[PDB]
Amino acid sequence: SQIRQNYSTEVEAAVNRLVNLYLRASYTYLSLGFYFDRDDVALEGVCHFFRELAEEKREGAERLLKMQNQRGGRALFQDLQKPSQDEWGTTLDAMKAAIVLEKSLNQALLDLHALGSAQADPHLCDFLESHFLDEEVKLIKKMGDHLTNIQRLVQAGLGEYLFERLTL
Amino acid sequence: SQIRQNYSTEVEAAVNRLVNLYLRASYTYLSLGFYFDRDDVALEGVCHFFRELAEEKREGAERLLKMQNQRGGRALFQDLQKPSQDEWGTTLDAMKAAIVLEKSLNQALLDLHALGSAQADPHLCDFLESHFLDEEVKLIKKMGDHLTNIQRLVQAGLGEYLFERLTL
Amino acid sequence: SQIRQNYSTEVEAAVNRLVNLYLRASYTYLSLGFYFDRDDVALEGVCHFFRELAEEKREGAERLLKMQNQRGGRALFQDLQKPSQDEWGTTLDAMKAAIVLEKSLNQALLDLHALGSAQADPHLCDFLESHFLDEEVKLIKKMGDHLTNIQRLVQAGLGEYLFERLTL
Amino acid sequence: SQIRQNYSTEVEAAVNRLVNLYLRASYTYLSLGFYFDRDDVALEGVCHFFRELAEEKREGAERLLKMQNQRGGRALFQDLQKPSQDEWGTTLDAMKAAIVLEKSLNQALLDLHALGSAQADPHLCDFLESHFLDEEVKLIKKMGDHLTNIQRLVQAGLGEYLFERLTL
Ligand SMILES: CCC[C@H](C)C1(CC)C(=O)NC(=S)NC1=O
Ligand SMILES: CCC[C@H](C)C1(CC)C(=O)NC(=S)NC1=O
């Protein structure tokens, strides 16, 4: 590539993997969103919460793809694995699964940052810090807060309704 | 009729029956609405929900009557049977009865559509699809969502109050 | 399902398959979009054209999922297969592949409509006609128009630049 | 210096060198700009492109000088070497020379960042990342895109005119 400079093949490949992880995360949130839209689940606040997260992860993937091109790397796409569950249980179950997912994304980000540091790639490191690392930390804090409130509310049916109405 | 074209006597009669069904549905919702306005029931959100549905069914009947005339059919009215209950019990009972009513209207619509198809009456078929079929599907989904939330809330008295305050 | 009415297991499954097809189409357009964003391809008008299509297909999938829930069907997700190519060649190659993709989506829509008709499911048939069938016909006409203009322009390099600047 | 803290003599000197590089880059773009303003070259879009870059590099130098003072370093200026060419040939030649220049600036930035990291000077590292590293990456991507389009257009005279009219 005519523009490629200080961009290692290792980082390029790791960025492609992280794109796949973000798209897969988006797909998972899509599934979570429509599960709470089921007539036998019917928690619209929860549905909206997860659908918004699907959009955020998709946007994250697109930002990574833009950066890949800006650096002269080449986007390579793989199959997107279907979400790990077909039915997501209670709001509590769903939020626990969401925090597990975000922590795995966060760890992938931290791994990529470490790689960037080892390759002496400051543009990559700054890119991750500015657009991804703090966003993940804030989202995980929010999920933790939600989990704590859901747990304190669980009269389980009553608690789930009130959380959806008054928080989400 | 000078304007009548491709409008079978079978469809004409079925449309008159569907008008009666919609007016009867409107009357039922009128009764449901005023039951929840009783001082010993006193659930204003529920009262408003059903009164709005009474207006919707009445409007549906008028749209059918307009179409009957547009096609050159002749409106024939029958007695409107009084609603099946004088007292409607809990919000849960009422919502269950409402979904039963809507499914019966929906089935009458599907039957009429089938008749239209067999008579090769595309104007009728399009009319039902554009103004009735999707409206019914959306209303039934909403009722299902309500039923699910009411059920998860039923501290029965507390649940009924919260649903009325926070959803309706 | 408490709300499910006149919704066959066959249609439910076919809708799930069509969701997968739309998500896969969205993924393909995502890949096409970022290919034209490469510094060694650099056709921004083409990139934007395909990225907008990615968004349209994704929205189509979400509308299908909403309808699945409205009817009381159950969304089931499968792996999304990666796009059929990693590199998409010229604008001409890409547009040809795009029209092939849209025709396959269109055929899946026509198959589903035929299924709906055979199952006597007028809500499904109306849903497809109102939101999908005409959109596909219009998009395919537009692509055909583009293909014809690209072809008349192909001084191949010059033609590709002018099309991107003056049409897209 | 009363304010100087954690600012090594090595970084101070490297910053002075980078100021010289940016001023020299500004001077080069000034020359490129006025070459395309010649009546026997006459490509106003190209002239404007390079004149804007002259202003950007000059601003970059001033930001470095401001930072030097903020840290308690002492600005030292050297002769500015005249640009490497008096005449810049075709738009293609000029854009190639521009990308070579930007890559050399980028490498100087990466070297300075590496120095900062080795000296444990996080303020310097953050300063470069926030104001210089991403700007360079974006500018180099843009130049690569331009080069690719110029190349696809080169009927050389015709191609050069169209690029100037329709892109710049
Ligand atoms: C908002 C969900 C997006 C969706 C899950 C998905 C991946 C399947 C995505 O992340 N991005 C695009 S472009 N299309 C898609 O279908
Ligand atoms: C816009 C060009 C600026 C110009 C080349 C130059 C260096 C010669 C510069 O970069 N900055 C200042 S203050 N004066 C100058 O003459």
Tab-separated table of N, CA and C in Angstrom, chain D residues 35-136:
chain	number	residue	atom	x	y	z
D	35	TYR	N	3.359	27.311	-8.362
D	35	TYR	CA	3.637	26.648	-9.627
D	35	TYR	C	2.337	26.359	-10.396
D	36	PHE	N	1.317	25.858	-9.705
D	36	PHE	CA	0.050	25.559	-10.392
D	36	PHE	C	-0.773	26.813	-10.739
D	37	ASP	N	-0.341	27.957	-10.216
D	37	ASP	CA	-0.913	29.272	-10.540
D	37	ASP	C	-0.242	29.905	-11.783
D	38	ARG	N	0.856	29.317	-12.261
D	38	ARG	CA	1.498	29.771	-13.506
D	38	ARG	C	0.529	29.736	-14.681
D	39	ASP	N	0.618	30.725	-15.574
D	39	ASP	CA	-0.296	30.787	-16.717
D	39	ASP	C	-0.097	29.608	-17.664
D	40	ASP	N	1.088	29.001	-17.652
D	40	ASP	CA	1.344	27.836	-18.501
D	40	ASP	C	1.101	26.490	-17.784
D	41	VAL	N	0.518	26.558	-16.593
D	41	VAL	CA	0.128	25.361	-15.849
D	41	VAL	C	-1.367	25.466	-15.560
D	42	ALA	N	-1.753	26.527	-14.856
D	42	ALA	CA	-3.148	26.959	-14.761
D	42	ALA	C	-4.123	25.890	-14.269
D	43	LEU	N	-3.873	25.365	-13.076
D	43	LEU	CA	-4.776	24.402	-12.464
D	43	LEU	C	-5.158	24.926	-11.083
D	44	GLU	N	-6.193	25.758	-11.047
D	44	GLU	CA	-6.499	26.532	-9.856
D	44	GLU	C	-6.866	25.663	-8.659
D	45	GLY	N	-7.571	24.562	-8.916
D	45	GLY	CA	-7.934	23.626	-7.862
D	45	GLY	C	-6.692	23.038	-7.197
D	46	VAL	N	-5.672	22.756	-8.001
D	46	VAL	CA	-4.426	22.212	-7.475
D	46	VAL	C	-3.690	23.286	-6.672
D	47	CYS	N	-3.643	24.496	-7.218
D	47	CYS	CA	-3.036	25.614	-6.518
D	47	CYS	C	-3.665	25.801	-5.135
D	48	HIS	N	-4.994	25.806	-5.077
D	48	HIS	CA	-5.690	25.986	-3.804
D	48	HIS	C	-5.416	24.831	-2.837
D	49	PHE	N	-5.394	23.602	-3.351
D	49	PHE	CA	-5.106	22.431	-2.516
D	49	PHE	C	-3.769	22.585	-1.783
D	50	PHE	N	-2.732	22.981	-2.515
D	50	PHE	CA	-1.402	23.106	-1.932
D	50	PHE	C	-1.242	24.346	-1.041
D	51	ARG	N	-1.883	25.446	-1.411
D	51	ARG	CA	-1.833	26.640	-0.572
D	51	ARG	C	-2.486	26.394	0.783
D	52	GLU	N	-3.578	25.635	0.798
D	52	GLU	CA	-4.226	25.273	2.052
D	52	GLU	C	-3.300	24.395	2.895
D	53	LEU	N	-2.576	23.487	2.239
D	53	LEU	CA	-1.616	22.651	2.964
D	53	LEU	C	-0.463	23.493	3.530
D	54	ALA	N	-0.039	24.529	2.804
D	54	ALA	CA	1.014	25.420	3.310
D	54	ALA	C	0.577	26.044	4.627
D	55	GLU	N	-0.664	26.511	4.658
D	55	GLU	CA	-1.232	27.081	5.870
D	55	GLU	C	-1.330	26.066	7.012
D	56	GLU	N	-1.769	24.843	6.710
D	56	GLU	CA	-1.814	23.787	7.727
D	56	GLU	C	-0.448	23.467	8.356
D	57	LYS	N	0.597	23.383	7.538
D	57	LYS	CA	1.933	23.064	8.060
D	57	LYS	C	2.475	24.211	8.899
D	58	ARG	N	2.227	25.425	8.435
D	58	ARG	CA	2.633	26.594	9.195
D	58	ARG	C	1.943	26.600	10.555
D	59	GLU	N	0.649	26.285	10.587
D	59	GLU	CA	-0.077	26.206	11.851
D	59	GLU	C	0.459	25.107	12.756
D	60	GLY	N	0.844	23.977	12.163
D	60	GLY	CA	1.470	22.890	12.899
D	60	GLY	C	2.751	23.348	13.589
D	61	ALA	N	3.593	24.078	12.861
D	61	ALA	CA	4.829	24.633	13.424
D	61	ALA	C	4.565	25.566	14.608
D	62	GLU	N	3.577	26.441	14.466
D	62	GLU	CA	3.210	27.361	15.533
D	62	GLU	C	2.685	26.637	16.775
D	63	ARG	N	1.972	25.537	16.576
D	63	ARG	CA	1.464	24.758	17.699
D	63	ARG	C	2.622	24.090	18.446
D	64	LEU	N	3.625	23.645	17.699
D	64	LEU	CA	4.830	23.077	18.295
D	64	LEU	C	5.611	24.129	19.086
D	65	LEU	N	5.665	25.342	18.558
D	65	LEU	CA	6.371	26.427	19.238
D	65	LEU	C	5.654	26.821	20.527
D	66	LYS	N	4.335	26.882	20.463
D	66	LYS	CA	3.541	27.153	21.647
D	66	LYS	C	3.826	26.104	22.734
D	67	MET	N	3.839	24.834	22.336
D	67	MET	CA	4.087	23.731	23.272
D	67	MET	C	5.493	23.794	23.862
D	68	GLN	N	6.483	24.084	23.018
D	68	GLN	CA	7.860	24.269	23.469
D	68	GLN	C	7.887	25.272	24.635
D	69	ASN	N	7.283	26.440	24.431
D	69	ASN	CA	7.198	27.442	25.497
D	69	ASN	C	6.396	26.985	26.722
D	70	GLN	N	5.289	26.282	26.496
D	70	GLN	CA	4.466	25.805	27.606
D	70	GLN	C	5.259	24.876	28.513
D	71	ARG	N	6.182	24.111	27.924
D	71	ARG	CA	6.993	23.155	28.676
D	71	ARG	C	8.269	23.775	29.238
D	72	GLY	N	8.567	25.007	28.845
D	72	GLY	CA	9.772	25.652	29.335
D	72	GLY	C	10.995	25.357	28.490
D	73	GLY	N	10.779	24.804	27.305
D	73	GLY	CA	11.861	24.633	26.352
D	73	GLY	C	12.144	25.962	25.665
D	74	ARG	N	13.222	26.016	24.895
D	74	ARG	CA	13.591	27.253	24.222
D	74	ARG	C	13.635	27.052	22.710
D	75	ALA	N	12.771	27.772	22.006
D	75	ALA	CA	12.741	27.715	20.548
D	75	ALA	C	14.074	28.145	19.958
D	76	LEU	N	14.607	27.327	19.065
D	76	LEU	CA	15.792	27.695	18.304
D	76	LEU	C	15.483	27.455	16.841
D	77	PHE	N	15.669	28.482	16.028
D	77	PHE	CA	15.343	28.394	14.620
D	77	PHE	C	16.595	28.191	13.774
D	78	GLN	N	16.446	27.441	12.689
D	78	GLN	CA	17.526	27.263	11.726
D	78	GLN	C	17.096	27.763	10.357
D	79	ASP	N	18.039	27.832	9.414
D	79	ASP	CA	17.694	28.207	8.046
D	79	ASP	C	16.619	27.284	7.544
D	80	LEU	N	15.703	27.819	6.746
D	80	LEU	CA	14.771	26.970	6.045
D	80	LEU	C	15.317	26.728	4.667
D	81	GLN	N	15.633	25.469	4.397
D	81	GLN	CA	16.059	25.032	3.091
D	81	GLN	C	14.969	25.236	2.048
D	82	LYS	N	15.368	25.699	0.871
D	82	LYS	CA	14.405	25.943	-0.195
D	82	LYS	C	13.842	24.610	-0.675
D	83	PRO	N	12.622	24.625	-1.228
D	83	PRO	CA	12.060	23.350	-1.688
D	83	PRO	C	12.980	22.656	-2.691
D	84	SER	N	12.817	21.345	-2.798
D	84	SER	CA	13.706	20.482	-3.563
D	84	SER	C	13.573	20.655	-5.074
D	85	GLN	N	12.496	21.290	-5.521
D	85	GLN	CA	12.297	21.524	-6.947
D	85	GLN	C	11.827	22.953	-7.190
D	86	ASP	N	12.122	23.474	-8.379
D	86	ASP	CA	11.661	24.795	-8.803
D	86	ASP	C	10.384	24.659	-9.632
D	87	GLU	N	10.270	23.528	-10.325
D	87	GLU	CA	9.108	23.206	-11.148
D	87	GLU	C	8.633	21.812	-10.780
D	88	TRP	N	7.321	21.627	-10.697
D	88	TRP	CA	6.777	20.433	-10.063
D	88	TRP	C	6.094	19.463	-11.024
D	89	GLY	N	6.184	19.742	-12.322
D	89	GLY	CA	5.684	18.819	-13.329
D	89	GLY	C	4.167	18.726	-13.400
D	90	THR	N	3.657	17.508	-13.444
D	90	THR	CA	2.221	17.306	-13.576
D	90	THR	C	1.576	17.227	-12.197
D	91	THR	N	0.246	17.254	-12.154
D	91	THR	CA	-0.465	17.100	-10.886
D	91	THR	C	-0.032	15.794	-10.228
D	92	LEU	N	0.141	14.771	-11.052
D	92	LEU	CA	0.577	13.466	-10.591
D	92	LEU	C	1.948	13.528	-9.921
D	93	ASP	N	2.910	14.163	-10.587
D	93	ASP	CA	4.237	14.324	-10.015
D	93	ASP	C	4.112	15.046	-8.686
D	94	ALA	N	3.331	16.121	-8.684
D	94	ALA	CA	3.235	16.971	-7.507
D	94	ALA	C	2.636	16.211	-6.319
D	95	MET	N	1.572	15.459	-6.578
D	95	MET	CA	0.908	14.691	-5.529
D	95	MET	C	1.817	13.582	-4.979
D	96	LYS	N	2.596	12.946	-5.850
D	96	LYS	CA	3.582	11.963	-5.405
D	96	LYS	C	4.610	12.612	-4.487
D	97	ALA	N	5.114	13.778	-4.879
D	97	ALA	CA	6.077	14.479	-4.044
D	97	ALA	C	5.441	14.891	-2.713
D	98	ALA	N	4.172	15.284	-2.752
D	98	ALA	CA	3.460	15.654	-1.526
D	98	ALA	C	3.316	14.479	-0.561
D	99	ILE	N	3.022	13.290	-1.081
D	99	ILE	CA	2.859	12.146	-0.198
D	99	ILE	C	4.209	11.733	0.404
D	100	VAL	N	5.276	11.821	-0.387
D	100	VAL	CA	6.626	11.578	0.118
D	100	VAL	C	6.959	12.525	1.275
D	101	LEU	N	6.649	13.802	1.089
D	101	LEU	CA	6.840	14.822	2.127
D	101	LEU	C	6.039	14.519	3.402
D	102	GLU	N	4.770	14.177	3.242
D	102	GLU	CA	3.944	13.888	4.409
D	102	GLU	C	4.419	12.634	5.158
D	103	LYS	N	4.840	11.610	4.419
D	103	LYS	CA	5.368	10.413	5.067
D	103	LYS	C	6.639	10.703	5.862
D	104	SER	N	7.475	11.614	5.358
D	104	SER	CA	8.674	12.003	6.100
D	104	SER	C	8.312	12.798	7.355
D	105	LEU	N	7.289	13.648	7.277
D	105	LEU	CA	6.827	14.354	8.476
D	105	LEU	C	6.268	13.363	9.479
D	106	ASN	N	5.457	12.433	8.980
D	106	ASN	CA	4.853	11.407	9.814
D	106	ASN	C	5.922	10.589	10.534
D	107	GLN	N	6.960	10.193	9.803
D	107	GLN	CA	8.046	9.426	10.416
D	107	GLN	C	8.776	10.232	11.501
D	108	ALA	N	8.972	11.528	11.261
D	108	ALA	CA	9.575	12.393	12.270
D	108	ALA	C	8.693	12.464	13.515
D	109	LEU	N	7.375	12.512	13.315
D	109	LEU	CA	6.428	12.500	14.436
D	109	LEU	C	6.507	11.191	15.219
D	110	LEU	N	6.541	10.074	14.498
D	110	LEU	CA	6.638	8.769	15.137
D	110	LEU	C	7.963	8.644	15.901
D	111	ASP	N	9.045	9.175	15.333
D	111	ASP	CA	10.337	9.157	16.027
D	111	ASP	C	10.281	9.970	17.313
D	112	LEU	N	9.647	11.135	17.247
D	112	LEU	CA	9.553	11.996	18.423
D	112	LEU	C	8.698	11.339	19.494
D	113	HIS	N	7.633	10.675	19.062
D	113	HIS	CA	6.768	9.988	20.004
D	113	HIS	C	7.565	8.890	20.711
D	114	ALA	N	8.346	8.137	19.939
D	114	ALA	CA	9.173	7.068	20.496
D	114	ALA	C	10.153	7.640	21.522
D	115	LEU	N	10.753	8.780	21.191
D	115	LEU	CA	11.657	9.464	22.111
D	115	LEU	C	10.923	9.835	23.400
D	116	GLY	N	9.750	10.445	23.249
D	116	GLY	CA	8.926	10.818	24.382
D	116	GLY	C	8.632	9.621	25.266
D	117	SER	N	8.261	8.503	24.649
D	117	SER	CA	7.967	7.284	25.393
D	117	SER	C	9.193	6.808	26.176
D	118	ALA	N	10.353	6.817	25.528
D	118	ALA	CA	11.595	6.400	26.180
D	118	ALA	C	11.995	7.342	27.325
D	119	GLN	N	11.641	8.620	27.207
D	119	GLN	CA	11.953	9.602	28.242
D	119	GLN	C	10.849	9.655	29.303
D	120	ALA	N	9.832	8.809	29.153
D	120	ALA	CA	8.649	8.828	30.020
D	120	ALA	C	8.023	10.230	30.104
D	121	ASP	N	7.684	10.790	28.946
D	121	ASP	CA	7.130	12.143	28.860
D	121	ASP	C	5.716	12.038	28.301
D	122	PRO	N	4.744	11.680	29.153
D	122	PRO	CA	3.379	11.452	28.659
D	122	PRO	C	2.711	12.706	28.106
D	123	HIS	N	3.067	13.893	28.591
D	123	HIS	CA	2.429	15.085	28.036
D	123	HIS	C	2.791	15.238	26.561
D	124	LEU	N	4.066	15.022	26.236
D	124	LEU	CA	4.524	15.105	24.848
D	124	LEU	C	3.807	14.084	23.981
D	125	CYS	N	3.781	12.841	24.450
D	125	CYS	CA	3.123	11.776	23.708
D	125	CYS	C	1.650	12.092	23.424
D	126	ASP	N	0.929	12.584	24.427
D	126	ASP	CA	-0.478	12.934	24.241
D	126	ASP	C	-0.651	14.107	23.278
D	127	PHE	N	0.220	15.099	23.411
D	127	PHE	CA	0.217	16.256	22.524
D	127	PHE	C	0.333	15.843	21.052
D	128	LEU	N	1.262	14.941	20.750
D	128	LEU	CA	1.482	14.507	19.372
D	128	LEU	C	0.296	13.716	18.839
D	129	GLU	N	-0.288	12.896	19.695
D	129	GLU	CA	-1.383	12.037	19.275
D	129	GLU	C	-2.628	12.852	18.984
D	130	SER	N	-2.886	13.833	19.839
D	130	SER	CA	-4.095	14.644	19.745
D	130	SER	C	-4.083	15.636	18.582
D	131	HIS	N	-2.914	16.178	18.255
D	131	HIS	CA	-2.862	17.247	17.256
D	131	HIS	C	-2.144	16.926	15.943
D	132	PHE	N	-1.402	15.825	15.897
D	132	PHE	CA	-0.538	15.591	14.742
D	132	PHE	C	-0.687	14.227	14.104
D	133	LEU	N	-0.663	13.172	14.918
D	133	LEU	CA	-0.637	11.815	14.372
D	133	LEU	C	-1.874	11.482	13.549
D	134	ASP	N	-3.061	11.812	14.048
D	134	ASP	CA	-4.268	11.439	13.304
D	134	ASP	C	-4.447	12.355	12.096
D	135	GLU	N	-4.063	13.618	12.244
D	135	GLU	CA	-4.109	14.556	11.129
D	135	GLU	C	-3.249	14.070	9.962
D	136	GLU	N	-2.033	13.611	10.261
D	136	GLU	CA	-1.158	13.039	9.245
D	136	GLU	C	-1.769	11.806	8.602
